[PDB]
Design a protein around this nucleic acid. Structure first.
Lengths: 199, 198, 199, 198
DNA sequence: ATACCACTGGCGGTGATAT
DNA sequence: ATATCACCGCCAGTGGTAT
DNA sequence: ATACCACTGGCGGTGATAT
DNA sequence: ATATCACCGCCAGTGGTAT
């Protein structure tokens, strides 16, 4: 028959068409050049772009790969569907990502990590990439001796802490270890896992 | 028309067996699963007995009702569900293994984001040994580094160092030793390692 | 008056126009959007693109920066002029660049280095980037004890060599030092300078 | 019309002085330089006396005839010649300095490719000390690392380590010492070092 | 050999039309 | 949003010249 | 509670026109 | 090189049913 595209598919097509017309020259693609990649004809490509045929998860997956974008960039609904379907194979956790350069923390792309990486249910957590390593930080953990993502007077660095009597601390990890009170250091989270490449 | 592909009925074989063997624990009938899928009882029976094949949606939906991963009853479908998960949050699914007592045993396929590796990992392995996760490039050129090797049937992580004369310097044990290139079967090179604390 | 664009300027304009029409959407630019960046009007922009006004070194420099390309990509003549003019300030040497990953050497972008970096006239030289460092290699140097870019049975690595009696060698730099004959190692050049970032 | 900008005649002041003071060594007259530039003697006299200003071409051309860098007689022109050299082989011109006896002295401006620095270097310095080249980020946030510092008039390379209480751990001498942040003037942070062998 | 003198060719634009 | 049209200021150079 | 039976709605295309 | 036009196979599901 003919179904009229329930107006989220219609607006998804508009973003998809807009995200293609401005990047076809960037990638040297045409509607037939995309038709061959999907195993279709040019008639089928224009239907998806001009909001005549409703695209599915498979087509959205390939269309995102052809344009090297995310389905979120043109269809946030299916990306929710993709994440929901991926909860069946393995509950990979979408951890917000950060970068630590010059002791400065900046938000970055969210990071996908399987729940098997962690021995505890990391609900509020971060993923900081620094010095060729990725540090997985538990934002809600009790203060104890261990590896912590701390802040010392406007500088963020990974340091190993050791509680001392008299409400003092021992900070290790920097080029020079030192001691100070527990309130001289702001704790942003406890490091629970470290990933690194060949060193 | 009922031309189900040989594996599409093979998908139904495991799916049907999982349903009846586990419906006692979950206490659900076919029409109860039908309600949770927005379907009738007639729609669910087709999938179980091999009348109608499974798509990506209801196969993952059934994998949430039954506490079973979709790869357990349909490896082909779970492969394509991942291939859709590369479009959003482009993680890279890697076959999982465990290394205990120099024996490599298969494990659950792991979900790893592509931002872990500087070099793209086409054929990769994830091995869980000594409480850590070792990521291995199955097809990697022989370079001095950490390698998952096979020494006369024993699987172990060793540090390979190439020496002139097609020799190797295997390290990792109490005392390192030297041998030829062909004396060891190098499964792949370790590119990343992950471990927890406490 | 009116000068007819001596046919290298004409063909330079064709490449410039071609390199702009396929990247204006990639950069969100129009002829007026480029006119404001150069301090001109849209009429002046079209003259350069359509081969009516001959562009100079200054305009080519800005046009290359606006499109984030090199003048070589659309006007190899002026890039020669730019290099010739830059020989007046400081004779920066255009050294061919290489990358060394997994003990595999691959050609890369040519590297610009001032002649003050070297104490000798490095005519035939390489620049290899590896392990966060840039190694400047003299391809024509006498064999002697020092840092060399060698090849050992199909693997390229930076190793420190030491000549030994009996036509033997000592190779250092790898994870395991070893000894072998001088003919068991192929020498591709002698390292004369090393640059590195914060380590 | 003869409206030469104040510096454009200042360009001619140094250029004219360089020509006459060095024409004895090179043994060339104005018409001889005119021949090498595709010009007449009348065209060269305008540039020397300040009648016609210099563009990028003949200023660099004159910098090749006279064995003098164009920055010596025209800093403004050499700046724009570099700004054209960023379009092809995008090197980054950095002000050069030498560090001898704790005294920072200016030197020739260095030509460095942008592929040396992970982070773009807007305001940078190149310092030649102890036979090596230290690249310094003039405007860099205070982070634990190697810094070009000024300690009561003395210029030196030191390893700064921040300590709680707005303190510093200065290292590099026989014995390190501690002081406050404001006790030292940090000119900039060292991001790259180059050295030769033999 | 070199520093003035008008004189001027063409470089590098402008500013309004379409379409 | 681009292309093609006259139109042109105005420093670049020129020759010719008296030092 | 569950496995057959036709029957069929609409999903996801095709294939030729312009322009 | 794109847009809009009919046209439609054909597995997806449906209800109804006898276990």
């Amino acid at each position: 028959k003919k179904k009229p595209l329930t107006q989220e598919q219609l607006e998804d097509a508009r973003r998809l068409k807009a995200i293609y017309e401005k990047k076809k020259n960037e990638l040297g693609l045409s509607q037939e050049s995309v038709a061959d990649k999907m195993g279709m004809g040019q008639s089928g490509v224009g239907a998806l772009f001009n909001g005549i045929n409703a695209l599915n998860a498979y087509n959205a997956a390939l269309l995102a790969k052809i344009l090297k974008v995310s389905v979120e960039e043109f269809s946030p609904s299916i990306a929710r569907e993709i994440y929901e379907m991926y909860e069946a194979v393995s509950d990979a956790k979408r951890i917000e990502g950060f970068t630590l350069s010059e002791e400065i923390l900046k938000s970055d792309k969210q990071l996908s990590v399987d729940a098997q990486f962690f021995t505890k249910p990391l609900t509020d957590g971060m993923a900081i990439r620094s010095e060729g390593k990725i540090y997985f930080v538990d934002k809600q953990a009790s203060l104890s001796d261990g590896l912590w993502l701390v802040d010392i007077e406007g500088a963020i660095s990974i340091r190993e802490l050791t509680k001392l009597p008299g409400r003092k601390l021992h900070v290790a990890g920097g080029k020079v270890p030192f001691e100070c009170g527990i309130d001289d250091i702001k704790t942003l989270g406890r490091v629970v896992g470290v990933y690194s490449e060949v060193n």
